[PDB]
Design a protein around this ligand. Structure first.
Ligand code: NDP
Ligand code: LDT
Ligand code: CL
Length: 316
């Protein structure tokens, strides 16, 4: 399959990237170096992951080594919830740029629609436990994102974990200057996201699927939770194709015209996950995988469920 998808800013985005949430800081430099050496050209990052400096060491070394050129890389990061303030967006972006050793990002996302009170804590809480919101809305934050394009800090802007009425709000913004290029959302066979994906694709927004393997390293994993990688129905499709279950789980979103960002810090798996360009799932395979939907989320931002902009009370 073609390796890149055209975005609505005119740039091409690699359809397979390396995820970095939970990648330990003492392992992620090597993970990203290995990834670039074996062909990855897209790294998904975020300030909240607390490892952008170490990701940046890898990127910089591979640029210095002339393994790749900067124009060939597609580096994504995200604006954390405590920086939804007109006066904080540029500095948040610049801190990410400084940590990643870059002078621009290919794509910068609003990480969640919910703004939180600024300060040192990523999840500022009241004495009773609930997230303390910001009064800044998704439209003013969007305007601040647009300024980053106009200042040359980022080539594209987008959103993450926006439901379709939140995407619609962005699209309907008075005076909208740049449409979102991407909506990055959780997507896998147990949370297949057909409604949100069709909405976004109909609007020309590219969808990136996160947690495509079901995030087995998520910190809140419970033994009785479903497991994609161990689902024997998925294993059977993999066996039929002489591929791993992970490889099927990665190819699946690719054939839905999605970008996909599996995370690994294991060198052998980083390579395995890239070897997804030499087989095709049939339409029957695709529909069968879609049939496994159970509306199951890895990421439900459960502390934030009263925030007025919490995304997952809406059907989609
Ligand atoms: N925008 C948002 O709100 C969010 C964005 N994301 C992004 O999406 C990325 C991917 O999602 P994430 O939640 O990390 O989880 P994934 O679904 O990518 O699963 C990662 C886990 O799968 C393991 N794994 C990777 N490859 C294989 C393989 N071939 N065989 C077996 N196990 C494998 C990893 O192990 P190991 O590393 O030990 O090899 C790790 O435990 C994140 O890292 C982040 O970049 C994720 C959640 C939210
Ligand atoms: O967010 C991530 O990329 C991956 O996950 C995280 C990554 C981090 F580095 C820190 C927290 C999270 C959590 S707990 N994320 C879930 C989450 C956060 C905020 C809101 Br609004 C809802 C929600 F569901
Ligand atoms: Cl972030």
């Amino acid at each position: 399959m073609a390796s890149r998808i055209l975005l609505n800013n005119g740039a091409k985005m690699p359809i397979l990237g390396l995820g970095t949430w939970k990648s330990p800081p003492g392992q992620v430099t090597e993970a990203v170096k290995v990834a670039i050496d074996v062909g990855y050209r897209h790294i998904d990052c975020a300030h909240v992951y607390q490892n952008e400096n170490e990701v940046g060491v890898a990127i910089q070394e591979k640029l210095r080594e002339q393994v790749v050129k900067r124009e060939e890389l597609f580096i994504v990061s995200k604006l954390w919830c405590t920086y939804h303030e007109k006066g904080l967006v540029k500095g948040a972006c610049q801190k990410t740029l400084s940590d990643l050793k870059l002078d621009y990002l290919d794509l910068y996302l609003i990480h969640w629609p919910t703004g939180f009170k600024p300060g040192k804590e990523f999840f500022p809480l009241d004495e009773s436990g609930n997230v303390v919101p910001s009064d800044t809305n998704i439209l003013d934050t969007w305007a601040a994102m647009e300024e980053l394009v106009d200042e040359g800090l980022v080539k594209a802007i987008g959103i993450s974990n926006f439901n379709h009425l939140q995407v619609e709000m962005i699209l309907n913004k008075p005076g909208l200057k740049y449409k979102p290029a991407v909506n990055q959302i959780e997507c896998h066979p147990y949370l297949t996201q057909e409604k949100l994906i069709q909405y976004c694709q109909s609007k020309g927004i590219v969808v990136t699927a996160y947690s495509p393997l079901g995030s087995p390293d998520r910190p809140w994993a419970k033994p009785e939770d479903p497991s994609l990688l161990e689902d024997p129905r998925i294993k059977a499709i993999a066996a039929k194709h002489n591929k791993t279950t992970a490889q099927v789980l990665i190819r699946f979103p690719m054939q839905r015209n999605l970008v996909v960002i599996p995370k690994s810090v294991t060198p052998e798996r980083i390579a395995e996950n890239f070897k997804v360009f030499d087989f095709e799932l049939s339409s029957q395979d695709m529909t069968t995988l879609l049939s496994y939907n159970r509306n199951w989320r890895v990421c439900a931002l459960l502390s934030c469920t009263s925030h007025k902009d919490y995304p997952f009370h809406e059907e989609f």
